[PDB]
């Protein structure tokens, strides 16, 4: 009702469009007023849903007015339009429209600036007074323009300050990161061109080196926001130093000019009167226009040679308004390359995770959403689309390309004419040759420019990043890390989930970053990070191989967490073996820096118990309330998991995981702000079910819904994967998650008996009965009986480790049932009756799934391997006297009928 | 006998099926375009030109060999019979034996096969007997049928050929890809509109909407003058209905197997330095597409260099030539960008990057005397010529070149053993197929 009143019941000159909708809204207003009066002194929801259907055209026209509303759902659109005067509802959706902006600064009912996701604050050039009668799209459009003008102002006066002769160490504390970055790149390309006019490069190389060392010195003593800014400028300046050093080593001028042509250059026109088109980027001759869109302080990529060649081929594709195509094995840096190219071009690249549910209408709606905005669109995992849909959208993509190339003002897609902004572009990242993925038709492949990035340069990445933390010996450590990873990949068993590419290196670095305060920035920290990342995912002999190579190529308290785990198992009835405690430590240390985890082991090997007792340990240690949502992936279909499009009226219905993500993002009652939320996919990892979450699992942390909704993943939202085997699990989702392999079972037989017995007596004097049944469960006979039970041929083959539960539950039920006649007999009779019941339970739980002769052999061996009461094949207890089945047969004389 | 041959071809592959209406229409065109032997000869060339375009390259050579066979076995003697059969047999690695000396063309074939040249030996019959060939333009122009279909393997598309054909015909193509019900309805509305008022239409990937193709297209083709229908399907895709394919003209599109023919095609499809650069780019594209077919030795995998790479490389060459107007052309930059960005993007391995870098260093040396192939040297343009004179000189120096019989080795600079193995295997397959075909 608040949304309906905001869109129709309060705004004037908005009810002249649809009079029937106005009358329906008035009737609903009268009904809601009557309901509110009755409450103060079911059918309403149905009426609201019925009148929601007529609002689709209104919302489509509203999205046509402001093109960035295409990234919002219908409910989000209702919320953002209905906030006529509150103005705070718009501020929560800026991450959904822009991506790099999380809130709006408000002051005296006027706007002052925006706030980036990384905590950066951008102050607008002129504060805009917000009228009470104004609508959302007008002030949103003028804010979109004002952000670009403010960014240009900061770039201009920062570049003037740098041209005046000051050092960057004082400028980095004044302006936003993008202004410093663009001004530094302009200054660098101007100075490099000046140096290239002559034969001298050593003076500028020394100047850049001293500036880098000064930035590194200032990095340690700076605030966190300034720390991120200096880190990103240091990545850029390391690229500058690398380019200048490569230029200095050129023998002749021709190769120096070629090497300078191959690299991105950031020029500025000195004649244009238009401010926002004054900066153009030149690489290999082609020129692209800077958009001056706000970026914030993103995680800047290390400018590897492969990254520069990818930038060159992306510029070559976009010069003719074609598409950018990146193909290769998973975990090589395709989406990140596209996003870094967009950030260098001063815009936020909007990334879409393709799926089977993306039909022609959904993909075409996304295309008209991004072409009307003018943003850059990345179609991540383009192979996951159906072949029919891929061939069908070829017309739309070719039409977009032709309209961009010929400068057409409008294009017609989805039976409607929409404006086409000249700033838009389309990119695709795809993984060829994977199971369960379609193939692009050639008519569609001719509209994209392919580039292969199979082999990245991990050494340069590791060296630059370790220099960013300021490690004393970066080159040797990076070489040791890369050689160690290569030796681990080449000298281990050829298992399917043994991938040691670049994502594992990034995880090692992200785990080594927060251990500097505990182990010190050096050899100990990097070997501890390598252990904490790679060791949980390795087997048994490969673990010994890992330890041997770690001792070869590398020279070399946790009391509270272990105490918490012990207490959690004590209240849960578990027992700390060496393997169980090792697995708990590995799970904790690997989840500390990885938000997505895969638990792989045999059936009933100890995955659920491991993560449940670790969850209890986290709750004890941190004090945070913890809520967990367990979802079986393959019980539900994809439509019921993620969501479905009601094709009758073209509206969106949420799935289950999407529903959980929405109710944790909405945060109505404040209970999800200071809590951890776990989604456990307790089924098989189907590629078709899990690859729809690739943007969720990687650093994007976003769930690209079909209807354009972009739900971010909060930092306290962690995803588990409990499964049995990875036979069909593709490496794309393997490398995105910290894997925890269970080489052997985490519990012993006797401990499992004790835990099941404790659970059974928790489910219910009793102390004497518990002592007697514990004494009767003698381990010395039980281990040999279980060892002998493996010789029997069992139908429906189950390991004997899993049949303990049936034996203990059956035995406890039998004692509980016959406890009514246990207080009128002596100790020896009680022991004989209980051991007879236990032998019967063990027989029918271990050899109960075998033939009659096998059952007779097993009752023979349980009699020989246990003085006590003998168990015969027909033995039973009747109302408590032992008898046989001979006298229990009743005389049956059937009639004819 | 020819109809039985074509029926066997249709028995091999579903796309190669033949009706009687098309054959009788071709026989009518024989009369439209020693007397009875002259009509028989004209029938042979007319049926070859009409139904060669509906087959791929191996079946093109099979059909050419068996048709030249049937004609010569009719006309010539039994010594000619024995010589041709034993030469096919030694080409098929089934029967080994020298031919009996008599005219002259048999001696030419003996020279061509005793030099271990196999592809040229297969194409000798096509160059000898048949004196005409048909492209897509000749098929579209010389067909009474207003419905056309077009097939190709995966990872190749010939939509640009039809777009060029429509542009040269001053028509208006309208590409409607299939795969969704919205596109099916739009294609129905547009096909009705184009039948009412004229205009061309093209349907892309018709094998992805087989139910609609089986119902609507069947009932439409079964039942204006500036109207044509084009359909594109994949040769390795699912089977298409026989009557609908027999009611439409069938064309199989593939890249031109020749090297010099590819240069001539790319030259005819297009100051003095721009003409020189596009001539060099056409030569380089033909060389790399010729080398691409050799899977194990020319490259490491199977790649596909289409005309989009040629267009992007030509755009880059023009952008370099316009910006760098000081006559100091950055040849090294052009080499690096073509071998790395334009033609090197699809390359996944590293030996293939090395060989494309070697090719780009060979063809873009930027020297006054450049020897791109062992026979032809392309001099640089002078400082006093015009664009038309430069184009005429380049066409003249292109036309005087004669492709050698071993052009897959000398021009590509490859070891001879691999090329001999490839040619021997391909000619053995073709000759074995025509030997099995000619015995029934
Ligand atoms: N340390 C332990 N102490 C006592 N019992 C344990 C211990 N670890 C595991 N178990 C027991 O092992 C049994 C199987 O373990 P768990 O419940 O973790 O299975 P799982 O990994 O979820 O199995 P599946 O993949 O078959 O669903 C449980 O009944 C649990 O009680
Ligand atoms: N210079 C770099 N190049 C490539 N990847 C990098 C670089 N620096 C860091 N990375 C990390 O490598 C990962 C690459 O993921 P990516 O392969 O882009 O995903 P996708 O498989 O969807 O393309 C990212 O998580 C990123 O954090
Ligand atoms: Mg991806």
Curated annotation (Swiss-Prot), chain A:
Subcellular location: Cytoplasm, Cytoskeleton
Residues binding ATP, per UniProt: 328-335, 601-608
Coiled-coil features, chain-numbered ranges: 213-237
Region (AAA 2): 563-793
Signal peptide stretch: none
Ranges for region AAA 1: 290-511
Misc. remarks from the entry: Present with 195 molecules/cell in log phase SD medium.
Quaternary context: The dynein complex consists of at least two heavy chains and a number of intermediate and light chains. Interacts with DYN3.
Similarity comment text for this entry: Belongs to the dynein heavy chain family.
Described purpose of this protein according to its UniProt entry: Cytoplasmic dynein acts as a motor for the intracellular retrograde motility of vesicles and organelles along microtubules. Dynein has ATPase activity; the force-producing power stroke is thought to occur on release of ADP. Required to maintain uniform nuclear distribution in hyphae. May play an important role in the proper orientation of the mitotic spindle into the budding daughter cell yeast. Probably required for normal progression of the cell cycle.
Domain notes: Dynein heavy chains probably consist of an N-terminal stem (which binds cargo and interacts with other dynein components), and the head or motor domain. The motor contains six tandemly-linked AAA domains in the head, which form a ring. A stalk-like structure (formed by two of the coiled coil domains) protrudes between AAA 4 and AAA 5 and terminates in a microtubule-binding site. A seventh domain may also contribute to this ring; it is not clear whether the N-terminus or the C-terminus forms this extra domain.
Protein name from the UniProt record: Dynein heavy chain, cytoplasmic
Residues of the full protein shown: 1452 to 2383 of 4092
From Swiss-Prot, chain B:
Binding partners and assembly: The dynein complex consists of at least two heavy chains and a number of intermediate and light chains. Interacts with DYN3.
UniProt protein name: Dynein heavy chain, cytoplasmic
Family the UniProt entry places it in: Belongs to the dynein heavy chain family.
Domain notes: Dynein heavy chains probably consist of an N-terminal stem (which binds cargo and interacts with other dynein components), and the head or motor domain. The motor contains six tandemly-linked AAA domains in the head, which form a ring. A stalk-like structure (formed by two of the coiled coil domains) protrudes between AAA 4 and AAA 5 and terminates in a microtubule-binding site. A seventh domain may also contribute to this ring; it is not clear whether the N-terminus or the C-terminus forms this extra domain.
Domain of life, per lineage: Eukaryota
Cysteines engaged in disulfide bonds, as pairs: none
Cell compartment(s), UniProt: Cytoplasm, Cytoskeleton
Function: Cytoplasmic dynein acts as a motor for the intracellular retrograde motility of vesicles and organelles along microtubules. Dynein has ATPase activity; the force-producing power stroke is thought to occur on release of ADP. Required to maintain uniform nuclear distribution in hyphae. May play an important role in the proper orientation of the mitotic spindle into the budding daughter cell yeast. Probably required for normal progression of the cell cycle.
AAA 6: annotated segments: 122-319
Covered residues, full protein: 3627 to 4091 of 4092
Misc. remarks from the entry: Present with 195 molecules/cell in log phase SD medium.
């Amino acid at each position: 009702w608040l949304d309906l009143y905001g869109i129709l019941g309060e705004n004037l000159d908005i009810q002249n469009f649809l009079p029937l909708e106005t009358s329906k809204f008035k009737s609903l207003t009268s009904e809601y007023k009557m309901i509110t009066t009755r409450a103060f002194q079911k059918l309403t929801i149905d009426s609201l849903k019925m009148i929601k259907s007529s609002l689709s055209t209104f919302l489509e026209r509203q999205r046509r007015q402001f093109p960035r509303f295409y990234f919002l759902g219908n409910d989000d659109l209702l919320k953002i339009i209905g906030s006529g005067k509150h103005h705070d509802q718009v501020s929560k959706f800026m991450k959904k429209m822009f991506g790099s902006i999380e809130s709006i600064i408000f002051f005296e009912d006027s706007i002052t600036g925006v706030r980036s996701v990384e905590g950066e604050v951008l102050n607008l050039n002129e504060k805009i007074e917000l009228k009470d009668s104004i609508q959302a799209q007008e002030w949103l459009n003028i804010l979109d323009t004002e952000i670009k003008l403010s960014v240009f102002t900061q770039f201009r006066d920062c570049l003037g300050q740098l041209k005046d002769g000051t050092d960057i160490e004082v400028v980095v504390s004044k302006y936003i990161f993008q202004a410093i970055l663009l001004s530094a790149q302009v200054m660098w390309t101007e100075l490099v061109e000046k140096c290239l006019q002559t034969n001298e490069f050593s003076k500028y190389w020394k100047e850049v080196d001293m500036k880098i060392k000064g930035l590194l010195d200032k990095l340690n003593k700076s605030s966190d926001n300034v720390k991120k800014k200096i880190e990103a400028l240091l990545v850029e300046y390391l690229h500058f130093n690398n380019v200048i050093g490569q230029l200095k080593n050129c023998s002749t001028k021709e190769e120096a000019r070629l090497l300078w042509a191959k690299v991105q250059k950031f020029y500025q026109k000195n004649d244009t009167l238009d401010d926002l088109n004054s900066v153009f980027i030149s690489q290999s001759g082609y020129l692209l226009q800077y958009k001056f869109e706000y970026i914030g302080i993103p995680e800047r990529l290390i400018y590897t040679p492969l990254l520069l060649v990818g930038f060159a081929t992306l510029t070559d594709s976009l010069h003719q308004k074609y598409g950018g195509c990146f193909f290769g094995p998973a975990g090589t840096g395709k989406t990140e390359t596209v996003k870094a190219f967009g950030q260098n071009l001063g815009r936020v690249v909007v990334v879409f995770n393709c799926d089977d549910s993306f039909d022609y209408q959904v993909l075409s709606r996304l295309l008209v959403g991004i072409t009307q905005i003018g943003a850059w669109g990345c179609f991540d995992e383009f192979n996951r689309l159906d072949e029919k849909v891929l061939s069908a959208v070829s017309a739309n993509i070719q039409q977009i390309q032709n309209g961009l190339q010929v400068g057409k003002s409008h294009i017609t897609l989805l039976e409607e004419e929409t404006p086409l902004s000249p700033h838009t572009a389309v990119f695709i990242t795809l993984n060829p040759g994977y199971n369960g993925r379609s193939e692009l038709p050639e008519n569609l492949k001719k509209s994209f420019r392919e580039f292969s990035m199979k082999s990245p340069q991990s050494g340069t990445i590791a060296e630059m990043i370790l220099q960013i933390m300021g490690f004393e010996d970066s080159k040797s450590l990076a070489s040791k890390i890369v050689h160690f990873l290569e030796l681990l990949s080449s000298k281990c068993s050829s298992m399917n989930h043994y991938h040691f590419g670049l994502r594992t290196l990034k995880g090692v670095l992200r785990n080594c970053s927060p251990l500097v305060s505990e182990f010190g920035e050096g050899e100990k920290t990097v070997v501890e990070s390598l252990k904490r990342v790679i060791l949980p995912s390795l087997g048994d002999t490969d673990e010994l191989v890992f330890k041997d190579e770690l001792s070869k190529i590398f020279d070399s308290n946790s009391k509270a967490i272990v105490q918490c785990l012990k207490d959690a198992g004590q209240r849960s009835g578990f027992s700390m073996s060496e393997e169980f405690l090792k697995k708990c430590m590995q799970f904790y240390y690997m989840q500390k820096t990885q938000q997505a985890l895969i638990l792989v082991g045999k059936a009933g090997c100890g995955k659920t118990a491991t993560w449940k007792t670790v969850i209890d340990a986290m709750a004890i240690f941190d004090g945070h309330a913890n809520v967990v949502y367990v979802i079986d992936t393959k019980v539900l279909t994809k439509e019921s998991l993620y969501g479905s499009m009601l094709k009758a009226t073209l509206e969106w219905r949420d799935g289950l995981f999407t529903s959980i993500l929405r109710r944790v993002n909405d945060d109505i009652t404040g209970t999800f702000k200071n809590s951890r939320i776990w989604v456990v996919f307790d089924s098989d990892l189907d590629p078709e079910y899990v690859e729809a979450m690739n943007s969720v699992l990687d650093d994007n942390k976003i769930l690209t819904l079909p209807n354009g909704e972009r739900l971010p993943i909060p930092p306290n939202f962690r995803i588990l994967f409990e499964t049995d085997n990875l036979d069909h699990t593709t490496p794309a989702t393997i490398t995105r998650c910290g894997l925890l392999w269970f080489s052997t079972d985490v519990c012993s037989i006797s401990s499992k008996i004790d835990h099941l017995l404790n659970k059974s007596y928790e489910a219910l004097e009793l102390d004497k009965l518990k002592d007697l049944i514990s004494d009767s469960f003698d381990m010395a006979s039980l281990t040999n009986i279980f060892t002998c039970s493996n010789d029997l041929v069992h139908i429906l083959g189950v390991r004997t480790f899993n049949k303990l539960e049936t034996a203990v539950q059956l035995a406890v039920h039998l004692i509980s049932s016959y406890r009514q006649w246990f207080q009128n007999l002596d100790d020896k009779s009680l022991k004989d009756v209980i051991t007879l019941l236990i032998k019967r339970s063990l027989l029918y739980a271990l050899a109960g799934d075998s033939t009659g002769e096998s059952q007779r052999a097993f009752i023979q061996t349980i009699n020989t391997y246990f003085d006590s009461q003998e168990l015969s094949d027909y033995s039973t207890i009747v109302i408590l006297s032992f008898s046989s089945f001979c006298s229990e047969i009743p005389s049956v004389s059937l009639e004819a009928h | 006998k020819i109809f039985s041959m074509l029926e066997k071809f249709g028995q091999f592959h579903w796309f190669y099926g033949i009706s009687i209406g098309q054959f009788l229409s071709c026989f009518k065109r024989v009369f439209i375009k020693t007397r009875v032997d002259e009509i028989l000869w004209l029938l042979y060339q007319e049926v070859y030109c009409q139904f060669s375009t509906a087959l791929d390259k191996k079946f093109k050579m099979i059909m050419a060999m068996t048709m030249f066979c049937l004609y010569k076995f009719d006309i010539e003697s039994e010594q000619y019979k024995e010589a041709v059969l034993t030469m096919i047999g030694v080409l098929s690695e089934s029967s080994d034996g020298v031919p009996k000396l008599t005219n002259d063309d048999l001696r030419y074939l003996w020279d061509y096969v005793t030099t271990k040249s196999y592809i040229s030996a297969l194409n000798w019959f096509k160059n000898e007997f048949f004196v005409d060939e048909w492209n897509i333009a000749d098929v579209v122009a010389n067909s009474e049928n207003n419905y056309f279909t077009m097939a190709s393997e995966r990872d190749v598309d010939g939509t640009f050929k039809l777009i060029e054909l429509a542009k040269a015909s001053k028509e208006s193509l309208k590409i409607i890809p299939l795969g969704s019900i919205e596109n099916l309805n739009y294609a129905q509305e547009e096909i009705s509109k184009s039948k009412i008022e004229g205009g061309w239409i093209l349907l892309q990937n018709i094998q992805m909407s087989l139910s609609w193709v089986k119902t609507y297209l069947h009932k439409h083709v079964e039942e204006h003058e500036k109207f044509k229908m084009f359909m594109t399907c994949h040769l390795t895709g699912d089977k298409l209905p026989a009557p609908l394919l027999q009611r439409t003209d069938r064309v199989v599109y593939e890249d031109i197997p020749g090297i010099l023919d590819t240069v001539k095609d790319l030259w005819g499809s297009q100051g003095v330095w721009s003409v020189y650069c596009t001539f060099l780019l056409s030569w380089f594209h033909a060389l790399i597409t010729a080398r691409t077919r050799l899977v194990p030795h020319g490259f490491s995998k199977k790649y596909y260099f289409n005309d989009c790479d040629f267009q992007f490389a030509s755009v880059y060459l023009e952008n370099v030539l316009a910006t760098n107007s000081t006559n100091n052309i950055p040849w090294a930059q052009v080499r690096d960008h073509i071998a790395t960005i334009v033609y090197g993007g699809k390359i996944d391995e590293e030996k293939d990057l090395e060989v494309v870098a070697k090719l780009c260093a060979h063809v873009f040396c930027g020297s006054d005397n450049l020897q791109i192939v062992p026979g032809v040297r392309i001099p640089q343009p002078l400082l006093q010529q015009s664009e038309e004179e430069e184009r005429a000189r380049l066409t003249a120096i292109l036309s005087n070149t004669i492709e050698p019989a071993d052009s897959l080795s000398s021009w590509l600079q490859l070891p001879r053993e691999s090329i001999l193995d490839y040619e021997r295997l391909q000619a053995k397959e073709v000759a074995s197929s025509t030997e099995q075909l000619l015995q029934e």
